[PDB]
Amino acid sequence: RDGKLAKPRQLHNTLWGMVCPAETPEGHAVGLVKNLALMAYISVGSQPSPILEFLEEWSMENLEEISPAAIADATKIFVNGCWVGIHKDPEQLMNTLRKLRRQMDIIVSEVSMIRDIREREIRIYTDAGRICRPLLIVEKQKLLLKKRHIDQLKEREYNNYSWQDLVASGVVEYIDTLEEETVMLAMTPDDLQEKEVAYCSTYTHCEIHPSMILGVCASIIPFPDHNQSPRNTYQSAMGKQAMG
Amino acid sequence: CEQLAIELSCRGVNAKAYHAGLKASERTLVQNDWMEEKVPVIVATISFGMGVDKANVRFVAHWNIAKSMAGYYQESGRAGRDGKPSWCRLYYSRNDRDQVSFLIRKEVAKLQEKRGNKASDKATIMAFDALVTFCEELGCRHAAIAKYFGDALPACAKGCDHCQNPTAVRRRLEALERSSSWEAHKREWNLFYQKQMQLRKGKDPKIEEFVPPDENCPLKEASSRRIPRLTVKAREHCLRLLEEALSSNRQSTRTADEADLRAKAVELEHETFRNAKVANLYKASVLKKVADIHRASKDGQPYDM
Amino acid sequence: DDEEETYRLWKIRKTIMQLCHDRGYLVTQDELDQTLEEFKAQFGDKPSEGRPRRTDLTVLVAHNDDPTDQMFVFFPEEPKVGIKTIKVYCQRMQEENITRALIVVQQGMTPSAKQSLVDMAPKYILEQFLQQELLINITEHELVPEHVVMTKEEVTELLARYKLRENQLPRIQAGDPVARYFGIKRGQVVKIIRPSETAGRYITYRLVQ
Amino acid sequence: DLCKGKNICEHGGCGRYQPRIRRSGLELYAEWKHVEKKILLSPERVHEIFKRISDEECFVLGMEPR
Amino acid sequence: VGIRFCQECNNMLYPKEDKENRILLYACRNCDYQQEADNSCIYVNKITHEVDELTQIIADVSQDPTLPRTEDHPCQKCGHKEAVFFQSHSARAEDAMRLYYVCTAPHCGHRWTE
Amino acid sequence: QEKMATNTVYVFAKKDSKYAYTGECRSCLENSSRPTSTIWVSMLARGGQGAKKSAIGQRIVATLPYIKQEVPIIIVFRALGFVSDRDILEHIIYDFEDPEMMEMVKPSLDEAFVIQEQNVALNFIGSRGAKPGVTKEKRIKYAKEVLQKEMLPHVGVSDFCETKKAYFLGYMVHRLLLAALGRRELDDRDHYGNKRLDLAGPLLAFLFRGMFKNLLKEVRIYAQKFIDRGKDFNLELAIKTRIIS
Amino acid sequence: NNELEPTPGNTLRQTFENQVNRILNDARDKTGSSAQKSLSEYNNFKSMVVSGAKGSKINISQVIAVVGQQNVEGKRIPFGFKHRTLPHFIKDDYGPESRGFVENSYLAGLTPTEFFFHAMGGREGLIDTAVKTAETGYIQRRLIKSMESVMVKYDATVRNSINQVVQLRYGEDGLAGESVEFQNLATLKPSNKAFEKKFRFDYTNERALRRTLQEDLVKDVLSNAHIQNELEREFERMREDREVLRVIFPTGDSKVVLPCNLLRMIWNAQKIFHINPRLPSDLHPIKVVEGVKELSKKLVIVNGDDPLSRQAQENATLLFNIHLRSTLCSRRMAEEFRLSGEAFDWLLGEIESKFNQAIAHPGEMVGALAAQSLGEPATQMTLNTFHAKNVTLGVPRLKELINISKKPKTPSLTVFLLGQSARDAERAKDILCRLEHTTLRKVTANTAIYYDPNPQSTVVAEDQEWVNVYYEMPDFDVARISPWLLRVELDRKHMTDRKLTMEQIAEKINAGFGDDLNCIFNDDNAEKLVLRIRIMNSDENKMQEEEEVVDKMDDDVFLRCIESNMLTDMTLQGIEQISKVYMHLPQTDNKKKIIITEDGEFKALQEWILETDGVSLMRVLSEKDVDPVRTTSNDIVEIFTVLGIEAVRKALERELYHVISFDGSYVNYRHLALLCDTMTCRGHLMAITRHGVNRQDTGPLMKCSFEETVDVLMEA
Amino acid sequence: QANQKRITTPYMTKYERARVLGTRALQIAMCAPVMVELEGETDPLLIAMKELKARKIPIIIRRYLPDGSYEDWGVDELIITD
DNA sequence: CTCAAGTACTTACGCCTGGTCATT
RNA sequence: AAAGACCAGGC
DNA sequence: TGAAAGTACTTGAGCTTAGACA
Numbered sequence A: 001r002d003g004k005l006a007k008p009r010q011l012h013n014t015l016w017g018m019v020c021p022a023e024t025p026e027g028h029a030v031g032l033v034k035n036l037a038l039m040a041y042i043s044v045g046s047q048p049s050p051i052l053e054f055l056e057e058w059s060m061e062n063l064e065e066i067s068p069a070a071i072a073d074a075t076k077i078f079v080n081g082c083w084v085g086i087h088k089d090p091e092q093l094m095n096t097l098r099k100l101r102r103q104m105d106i107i108v109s110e111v112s113m114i115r116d117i118r119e120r121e122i123r124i125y126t127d128a129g130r131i132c133r134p135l136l137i138v139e140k141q142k143l144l145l146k147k148r149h150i151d152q153l154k155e156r157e158y159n160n161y162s163w164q165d166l167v168a169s170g171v172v173e174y175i176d177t178l179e180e181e182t183v184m185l186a187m188t189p190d191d192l193q194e195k196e197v198a199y200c201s202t203y204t205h206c207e208i209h210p211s212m213i214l215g216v217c218a219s220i221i222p223f224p225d226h227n228q229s230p231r232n233t234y235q236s237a238m239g240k241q242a243m244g
Numbered sequence B: 001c002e003q004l005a006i007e008l009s010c011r012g013v014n015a016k017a018y019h020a021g022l023k024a025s026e027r028t029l030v031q032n033d034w035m036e037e038k039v040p041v042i043v044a045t046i047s048f049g050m051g052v053d054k055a056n057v058r059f060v061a062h063w064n065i066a067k068s069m070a071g072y073y074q075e076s077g078r079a080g081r082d083g084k085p086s087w088c089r090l091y092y093s094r095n096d097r098d099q100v101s102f103l104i105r106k107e108v109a110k111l112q113e114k115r116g117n118k119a120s121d122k123a124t125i126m127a128f129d130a131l132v133t134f135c136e137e138l139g140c141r142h143a144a145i146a147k148y149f150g151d152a153l154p155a156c157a158k159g160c161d162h163c164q165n166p167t168a169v170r171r172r173l174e175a176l177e178r179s180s181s182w183e184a185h186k187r188e189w190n191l192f193y194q195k196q197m198q199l200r201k202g203k204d205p206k207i208e209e210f211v212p213p214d215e216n217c218p219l220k221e222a223s224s225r226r227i228p229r230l231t232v233k234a235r236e237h238c239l240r241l242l243e244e245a246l247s248s249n250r251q252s253t254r255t256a257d258e259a260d261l262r263a264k265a266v267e268l269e270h271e272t273f274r275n276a277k278v279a280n281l282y283k284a285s286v287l288k289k290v291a292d293i294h295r296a297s298k299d300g301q302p303y304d305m
Numbered sequence C: 001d002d003e004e005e006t007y008r009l010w011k012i013r014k015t016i017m018q019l020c021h022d023r024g025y026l027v028t029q030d031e032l033d034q035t036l037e038e039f040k041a042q043f044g045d046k047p048s049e050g051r052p053r054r055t056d057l058t059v060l061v062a063h064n065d066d067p068t069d070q071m072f073v074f075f076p077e078e079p080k081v082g083i084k085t086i087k088v089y090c091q092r093m094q095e096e097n098i099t100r101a102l103i104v105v106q107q108g109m110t111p112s113a114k115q116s117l118v119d120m121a122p123k124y125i126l127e128q129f130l131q132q133e134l135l136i137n138i139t140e141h142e143l144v145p146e147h148v149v150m151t152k153e154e155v156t157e158l159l160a161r162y163k164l165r166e167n168q169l170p171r172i173q174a175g176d177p178v179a180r181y182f183g184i185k186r187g188q189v190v191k192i193i194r195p196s197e198t199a200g201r202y203i204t205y206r207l208v209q
Numbered sequence D: 001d002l003c004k005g006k007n008i009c010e011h012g013g014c015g016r017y018q019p020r021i022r023r024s025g026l027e028l029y030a031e032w033k034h035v036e037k038k039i040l041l042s043p044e045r046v047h048e049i050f051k052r053i054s055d056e057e058c059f060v061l062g063m064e065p066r
Numbered sequence E: 001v002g003i004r005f006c007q008e009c010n011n012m013l014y015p016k017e018d019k020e021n022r023i024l025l026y027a028c029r030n031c032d033y034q035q036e037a038d039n040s041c042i043y044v045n046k047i048t049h050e051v052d053e054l055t056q057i058i059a060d061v062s063q064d065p066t067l068p069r070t071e072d073h074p075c076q077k078c079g080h081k082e083a084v085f086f087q088s089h090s091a092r093a094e095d096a097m098r099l100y101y102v103c104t105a106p107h108c109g110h111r112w113t114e
Numbered sequence F: 001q002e003k004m005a006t007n008t009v010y011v012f013a014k015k016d017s018k019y020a021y022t023g024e025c026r027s028c029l030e031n032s033s034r035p036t037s038t039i040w041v042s043m044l045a046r047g048g049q050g051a052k053k054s055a056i057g058q059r060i061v062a063t064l065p066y067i068k069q070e071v072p073i074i075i076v077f078r079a080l081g082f083v084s085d086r087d088i089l090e091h092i093i094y095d096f097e098d099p100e101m102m103e104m105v106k107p108s109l110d111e112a113f114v115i116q117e118q119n120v121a122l123n124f125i126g127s128r129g130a131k132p133g134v135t136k137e138k139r140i141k142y143a144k145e146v147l148q149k150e151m152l153p154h155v156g157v158s159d160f161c162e163t164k165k166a167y168f169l170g171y172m173v174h175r176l177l178l179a180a181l182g183r184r185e186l187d188d189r190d191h192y193g194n195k196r197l198d199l200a201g202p203l204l205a206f207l208f209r210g211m212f213k214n215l216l217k218e219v220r221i222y223a224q225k226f227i228d229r230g231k232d233f234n235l236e237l238a239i240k241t242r243i244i245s
Numbered sequence G: 001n002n003e004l005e006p007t008p009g010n011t012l013r014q015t016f017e018n019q020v021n022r023i024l025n026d027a028r029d030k031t032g033s034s035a036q037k038s039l040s041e042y043n044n045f046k047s048m049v050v051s052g053a054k055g056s057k058i059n060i061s062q063v064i065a066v067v068g069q070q071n072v073e074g075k076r077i078p079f080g081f082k083h084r085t086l087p088h089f090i091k092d093d094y095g096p097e098s099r100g101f102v103e104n105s106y107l108a109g110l111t112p113t114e115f116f117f118h119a120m121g122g123r124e125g126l127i128d129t130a131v132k133t134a135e136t137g138y139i140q141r142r143l144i145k146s147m148e149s150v151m152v153k154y155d156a157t158v159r160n161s162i163n164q165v166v167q168l169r170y171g172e173d174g175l176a177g178e179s180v181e182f183q184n185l186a187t188l189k190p191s192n193k194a195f196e197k198k199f200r201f202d203y204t205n206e207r208a209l210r211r212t213l214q215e216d217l218v219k220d221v222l223s224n225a226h227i228q229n230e231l232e233r234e235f236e237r238m239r240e241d242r243e244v245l246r247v248i249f250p251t252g253d254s255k256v257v258l259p260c261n262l263l264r265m266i267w268n269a270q271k272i273f274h275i276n277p278r279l280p281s282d283l284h285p286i287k288v289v290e291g292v293k294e295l296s297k298k299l300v301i302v303n304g305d306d307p308l309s310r311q312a313q314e315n316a317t318l319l320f321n322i323h324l325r326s327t328l329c330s331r332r333m334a335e336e337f338r339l340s341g342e343a344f345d346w347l348l349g350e351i352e353s354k355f356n357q358a359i360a361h362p363g364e365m366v367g368a369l370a371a372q373s374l375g376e377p378a379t380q381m382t383l384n385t386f387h388a389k390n391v392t393l394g395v396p397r398l399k400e401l402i403n404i405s406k407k408p409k410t411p412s413l414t415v416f417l418l419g420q421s422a423r424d425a426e427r428a429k430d431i432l433c434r435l436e437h438t439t440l441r442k443v444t445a446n447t448a449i450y451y452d453p454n455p456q457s458t459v460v461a462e463d464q465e466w467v468n469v470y471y472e473m474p475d476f477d478v479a480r481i482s483p484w485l486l487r488v489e490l491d492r493k494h495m496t497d498r499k500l501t502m503e504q505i506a507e508k509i510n511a512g513f514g515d516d517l518n519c520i521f522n523d524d525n526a527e528k529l530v531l532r533i534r535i536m537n538s539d540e541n542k543m544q545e546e547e548e549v550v551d552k553m554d555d556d557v558f559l560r561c562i563e564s565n566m567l568t569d570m571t572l573q574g575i576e577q578i579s580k581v582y583m584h585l586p587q588t589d590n591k592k593k594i595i596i597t598e599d600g601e602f603k604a605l606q607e608w609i610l611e612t613d614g615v616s617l618m619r620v621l622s623e624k625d626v627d628p629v630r631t632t633s634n635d636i637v638e639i640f641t642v643l644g645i646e647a648v649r650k651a652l653e654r655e656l657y658h659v660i661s662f663d664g665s666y667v668n669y670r671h672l673a674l675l676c677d678t679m680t681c682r683g684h685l686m687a688i689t690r691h692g693v694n695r696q697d698t699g700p701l702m703k704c705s706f707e708e709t710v711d712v713l714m715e716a
Numbered sequence H: 001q002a003n004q005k006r007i008t009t010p011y012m013t014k015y016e017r018a019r020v021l022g023t024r025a026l027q028i029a030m031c032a033p034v035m036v037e038l039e040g041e042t043d044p045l046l047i048a049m050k051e052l053k054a055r056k057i058p059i060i061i062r063r064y065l066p067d068g069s070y071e072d073w074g075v076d077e078l079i080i081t082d
Numbered sequence I: 001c002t003c004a005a006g007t008a009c010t011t012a013c014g015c016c017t018g019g020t021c022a023t024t
Numbered sequence J: 001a002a003a004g005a006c007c008a009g010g011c
Numbered sequence K: 001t002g003a004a005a006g007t008a009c010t011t012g013a014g015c016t017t018a019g020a021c022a
Ligand SMILES: [Zn+2]
Pocket: D009, D010, D013, D014, D015, D016
């Protein structure tokens, strides 16, 4: 905390939805102590055994079998940082990986898949500690959240239907920070999905609710968007000191 | 001399010095008392070609290479005036020869500048190069000495590094090449550049032969050396080009005649020579003027002065 | 080019005459304000292989108080000054009986040259000036205030007035460019007059050491 | 600064040479060049050396003897 | 401009001057292999580095959902209306905010700059 | 607790450092053992020393763990069993039709001219270890063990993983060259995709791994003390639960 | 579509950001003005703002109209992601919404992206606040620890603990900083005609005297020639004072700090004595002159009859005496003030009493006071100041000045031009090119090394037309020439931007490498600019090579090294250490040329000036058409090595004033002068650190209390 | 120094006034005699203040000059700023 | 006998409140 | 109950 | 995981040159 470097202390764009932007201590620990957003979930970790077996079963090529002349055109495949091989059809591979994660057949929803298109790398992370938050999946310009899901969730009591079943339906999806890189989000469906003056049409995900970006203490602020950000931070700090 | 004397005395070897801006009086001692063992070791540069060649000269070492094989042998001959086995050693480095040659060049230069081209002008250069080769060649030192003197080559034994170990000295020579391949940087670059191009100059630089204009040079200030390496042939060829350009403009503009064009071209060449300093820039300006004349002819208007 | 070197020589000479005038040496007015054309006509235009070889650019001046001490300025033609040049210069000094002289060095000096300069303190004092340092007159800069060298009587009066010992005064290093401009040695005191926005004028005395 | 460049002791007697002293942690090494080398310079030896320094020499050195 | 590899030990070749025929040669320094030089150029250094970015632009970039796309600019090859556009996407690109367009639709992969 | 993501290749550039661009990869093996071994691959500013780089992007240099100073990247590649320059370039450069990348690799190949054998490359690396081995074979074995186990453990540790190690090292050098050419932006240190969080799980795991290793060390000490008599052994008195608790 | 022409000194991204920020700032200002113009007189935000109790106009603007653009590190919101600010935006979106501009106001409420950007801006502000800490506290402590013992002694000389003279009088005038106020000289910057019309006291009119002066005094003024002579002497002395002021105060700044407000006290005298301006006065102007002359003697800062004492007193009270004679002029008294005899006597007594009260009390600890008065604004100065021609400002600049940093972060040097270069932009560009360091690599399009065994072969097809003519004149054609060719391509835009021609490049090449290089180049007629370079060898033997391979350094790699040296060290134009030079017309009065016209007025001339990144003052001053007088540099150490120590005193004063008064805050000149003097008084540049505070010959207990403790006591 | 040739401001500085008043009040609080007549005054501070206003404080101020000399100024000799 | 080129070496940071903790 | 360490917090 | 600026130490380079005038 004694270090006068100000860059690490700043609020980075990557903190959207995962770390509370307002709630942070004031003092030598400003920006260095971060409180978690409401929807943020930390990856618990998983063995990348089924993913490797599926990838080998899904063609691809093991590094000992590459001809180095045929690796420039192909796209490298990374699992937990290890370079396991290359693939020549990124489209169907990524589509199948996402489909499997949505259906939770071989790949748990915690695992994340990243396709760096320009750099031709595909990275799959199963290690623990990754920060991730749920996001609705958008197909074309329509959500995968339909009226039946909400109707069943209103009936959540004595229905044995909960958030887990909603995840297993391929409707919501856990996306980490570096998978958020390749995603395109919308604020609300009823505003950004319907046709208007063309801004974007390739929306792949939609936020549950934009207020989920705030942390625990900052969520108690009524109308926090009408406040100066320093005042929101001050309230987030003082809320822990409120008596009750 | 002072540095080696001080370092040797600090290392134990009772050292000393012959010259140092001191005086016969301020060295007569150092020298004489060197014969009578009062001073064991004394260092000098060329001040020991005299002074009673004594008997018990145990060694002669060269911290820096000599000026030639003749010079090296005449230093090394101030030893061995007995049966004493006197292993005389030469210390060598690429940095040293580099320096020596650069100054042998500066000397040869000044000499030629205030003189003419003699056999000694290249004799010093090839003598130093012979010394470099001898310190760089592979073989018996006595054999190389005899070859330089043209005497019978002796197949000596236990008399040089070559005959002691047939691979250790070879290893040292190989490591010499492997020792170094190929605001502090400016002097390094200057030294490296000049040293490298001294190799391109090689031996017997000479080659000046400024031939005077033969009989009828049409050049104002023809006998001028303000531009180095601008021999008169280059000059009247450039004037020939200028007169060709003037004749082309005369054909393309229909002015009086070429009789005045001779003096006009002489004036143009003299002006270009005055505005120029070096041969390449002089040619650049000459053909720039020629191109301007051609452009004026292309446009159509007469080429006014 | 050569014209740039001629301009350099003219500027250096003009600054040297201004320096000599500021030291109390007798300098004619025309010498102070010499046009570039007048200088080129007097000394012969191009220095490179030309009439001004940086020798005959030497300036011989005498002090206003007495003409015996004189003062004399040197423009060595060598890019660097060695022992021989300083020795022949000192021989000329001794023959001419002059004691004070300057040296205008092109780039730098050998350290034997500096050792010889510091050798004779009482007999002849020699000050080394770089070619670049004399291309301008630092005393004319707006940041540099007016410096006046005080005689021993004025220094004694100043010390008696404020009951000050010498070491209690503010100091100015002998290597200071302004101190070198006036050729000041250790122990002298300079009177500095600078304007102020609170009093209008303020005088500071700096000891040279 | 002046005395560091004198590796030899003349003036006076004792014309023997002077070793370099290096500090390795808390240890002083009287690094002789060629005269035993790297002898551990014990503080007792340094105390003996300093005890014989005359008052005039140490005052010249800057430390008042009293 | 480029480098060529040895044909015997599969090492790197180096330019070597032929004193006799005055022809440029590439001779491996780890063996005795020598080959003739065709381009007759050794070292090329483009200070302005004005290398056309179209060669460094990959066709699959058109798959990006995060990239803006326009209907105004059609492709030159297939005349496809849909096209994805983006900026230099590179550092040390001097001063250039110009747009690079990639044609969408499969198997086209056309890249053009306006 | 925040931390850099392990096993990921990052490229950074320090202003006044000797390295113009530095690529690093903090590598840990499946969380199973050892905290982290970090390898740095960097390029040396702008300048030479009389016989080296004087042109466009200069020699690439690798920094191995437990090696006293830098080691050239091509020498490291040769120590992995790739003697010919074309194989090393193929591992480093994936498309030979790019001459800019090739020219950037050019100066690094010049330094590794002298070394052309895997054994001599290992000796070169072995002689630069924590303590130089007395004999050549000891140095070669130490360098081989370091490369096999303690250099990029996440790629592999057992035997024939040397080809995967070579591929990953080539990928690191390729990323460094891409950053030098400006084709990829330098990784920013505050990007939360590059950050991992050590929750109660990983933190207690890191604690318990070392604590249980110390418990085993104490058991071994008690056993060796108690077996010198050769009588017998009982485990229940050999285990101290106090250390873990 | 690339129609955006980059402004000089800025890249395309830089000028694009500048234009976008200009548009957004204009929009925010217009919306704020529109919102404020709609505020009713009953509105309480407007009430607080006009009252000045709390809030500002921008507060109302952000309340009602627009929050405004949000900035991080002085720039719009950066691309934390892959060329996008948030996942919700498309890549390469530089629009106001994507880069942080907030359209909504606090009353309307921010959108989630705008909310997050505002959060980032607030985080930056909070980081600045939590940083406004240890380093500025360190500045305070270091400054006072350097100044804690500086004191005004009983002879009013400011001395430290060793009794060394820091200042002869405190603040150079011996006045305390509490009682002084701002005043106008009123003699600086009027026209000569107006100056005489206001200050001459023309007695020839004989009618205006009857109206302003009493009828009895008019005959006395007119008849007696002594009165007229003394009044003319007074006017001559006032003209001399005007000349002295114009020497002291260039730029025509009449706002000065003086002990007693003469205008307010004259007005107080008017009100106390019921002075009626409509009636002629009984005050005799000669009595005014005598009263002023007598009063000037009783205002004593330096006590003594010595000529040195006389001069010190005159210098110390010079400015205030000039102002006193200006305001108490006979014509002013008779025309504007109409003071009577009793009012004038009371005014003189009050002036004397107030000036005597303003004198600094001996024993006042002015060192600690000055240090704390200089470091206190540092707690209000921008720590991470951002605000091209970037210059370090605020706390980092204060640290650079205080610590006497050898290398400033932004060392710059302003240049003023003497002749037509100041007015004409072409000569200004010429000087800029002659001052900006330009190597070969800054003007080369590309460089290639070819192999040309025969020069007439010309493996490059385009060159065959023009290489043959240089290769046909005697010699210089074949033999004794390296077959290796270094062909260099020159960028025309860079070639002509610096007004550089190929002949000068060739001259520099020849000077750098000698005649042993063959330099051939095209003409300006050619569409592309090329330059062919070869190596010349004089070795005519060329047999057996004499084993030159020892250090031959073959022509290929030799040409590569030569090309590197050319591209990195050719220094074609300008002087090294000067990265780039900015040129602009200053609209600020401090950087403009101010002259005294024929009418005596102050006119500010608009002339081109040059500002450089990187500093080399000695060579810049030596360059032609560069003003040797007004050209300064912000870095301090180089001024010490170039212009002396008093120049450092003045320049450090100016730099400290600039870093302090940039925010608009004002600090009394006495504290700045005291700090600058205590730094530049031992003869060298004494930095305010443990390296320089302990370098003084003070007591070891003084040093041990500051940052060194045990080591200092060990040494002592 | 002597009574003649005294160089110092005749005005009493704020520091001199403060210390003189404090020392006098301490003396009066130690039952020192009071020069001026007091009217029902029990606090030594205001008594000393009224003594100072009456020029009756029996204290001379020893002003040390930086050169080591000194000047003796009686309180009544100094003129109070207030 | 330098001096520039390196390597160690040293810095610090306003006051106030409280809690826990392992060792003594 | 002294002297340390760490943490959290106020201005 | 980043991270800073000035200063006190060592060390190790690095250089044409010989005769006969006071
Ligand atoms: Zn001794």
